Amino acid sequence: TRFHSFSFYELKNVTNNFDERPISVGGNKMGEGGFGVVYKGYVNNTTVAVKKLAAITTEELKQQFDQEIKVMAKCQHENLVELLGFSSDGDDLCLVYVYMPNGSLLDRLSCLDGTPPLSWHMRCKIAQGAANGINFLHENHHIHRDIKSANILLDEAFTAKISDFGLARASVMTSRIVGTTAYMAPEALRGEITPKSDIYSFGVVLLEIITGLPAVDEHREPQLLLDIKEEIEDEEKTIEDYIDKKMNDADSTSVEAMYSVASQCLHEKKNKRPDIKKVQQLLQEMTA
Ligand SMILES: CN1CCC(n2cc(Nc3nc(OC4(C)CC4)c4nc(-c5cnn(C)c5)ccc4n3)cn2)CC1
Ligand SMILES: CN1CCC(n2cc(Nc3nc(OC4(C)CC4)c4nc(-c5cnn(C)c5)ccc4n3)cn2)CC1
Ligand SMILES: CN1CCC(n2cc(Nc3nc(OC4(C)CC4)c4nc(-c5cnn(C)c5)ccc4n3)cn2)CC1
Ligand SMILES: CN1CCC(n2cc(Nc3nc(OC4(C)CC4)c4nc(-c5cnn(C)c5)ccc4n3)cn2)CC1
């Protein structure tokens, strides 16, 4: 697959000079990370998302921009975001993607901008879709290294689409430890590079789908959502205590079936964790 080489001013045109005001206000800014700002645009009579990279050295940022392109050139799947083009220019790095009508999983779980809560049926399909996207990357010998709800984007049909490949690796140890701390496997925080870590991170994403809570809340007991696993095992709290109350269609059997998959993904021992193929098989058996 080949990408369109855009000019910074030819991208400044579609985003109305990268209007930093929100969409609701009438601007073009639709969100931010980690590591730049996602902007709304229209080009070839189609809506696009333009991410403007912000500088955590600028030489290391350029490497992630390059990794992104390399992975996006090789990998293409139904449950993966598609790269449209990029702007190289003089210290101005921008990536172009197709606009995701429903934004991110993080934002739909928090009902940001007054969006309706996701039903348990929509949540099961989003989890299945995301596991299919991770399956494609693991089959194509890639490790994402940053599986999180802000990187699981959603289209008009709520089709889960994995994004941000700026840290992905082919198929081990490393001195430069990267990823999101609230989602990292114990061994990943220790410098190991294994697709078994991507499973741990997906286990956190699943607890977010069950609870509607963020992975980390400094003003919460426990601060890390992955710790609720221990509270449940210790009978300190139940799964019912943690189930998102913003659902009317969540049956106790399939919620506990999804919790079982998350609990297994969240094993301390990377080898005692199921592979993405077992994850997909369990998530499929959950909608039966
Ligand atoms: C600082 N940086 C700014 C941006 C700059 N730049 C890149 C392009 N275009 C481009 N670059 C590719 O190489 C990489 C990813 C940059 C290293 C590339 N690679 C593949 C490919 C196919 N299979 N695989 C495994 C990879 C396909 C298409 C590609 N197109 C234009 N400007 C590079 C330097
Ligand atoms: C200042 N800077 C401006 C921009 C300029 N620049 C141009 C490119 N274009 C590019 N580069 C590739 O390089 C590698 C090998 C991926 C890294 C590349 N590779 C493949 C390919 C297909 N199979 N494999 C194994 C690789 C296809 C197309 C490609 N296009 C990248 N940077 C550099 C200097
Ligand atoms: C300031 N600067 C602006 C940009 C301008 N510039 C344009 C290019 N375009 C380019 N460069 C490639 O490769 C090199 C030179 C980076 C390594 C390249 N490679 C492949 C390819 C296909 N298979 N493989 C394995 C590689 C395809 C297309 C490519 N296009 C390079 N510099 C120079 C001056
Ligand atoms: C009420 N409504 C307000 C509007 C709302 N909404 C829709 C979008 N569309 C969107 N947003 C992206 O980014 C986020 C979620 C803002 C941060 C995004 N990102 C990429 C991407 C792929 N890789 N990388 C590195 C980035 C591709 C496509 C995208 N599409 C944003 N908000 C829906 C609900």
Swiss-Prot record:
GO molecular function, one term: kinase activity
Post-translational modification: Phosphorylated.
Subcellular location: Cytoplasm
UniProt disease annotation: Immunodeficiency 67: An autosomal recessive primary immunodeficiency characterized by recurrent, life-threatening systemic and invasive bacterial infections beginning in infancy or early childhood.
Positions contributing to ATP binding: 30-38, 51, 148-151, 164
Organism: Homo sapiens
The name this protein goes by in its record: Interleukin-1 receptor-associated kinase 4
Superkingdom to which the source organism belongs: Eukaryota
Modified residues annotated as Phosphoserine in this record: 175
Gene: IRAK4
Record GO cellular component, one term: cytoplasm
Chief location category: cytoplasm
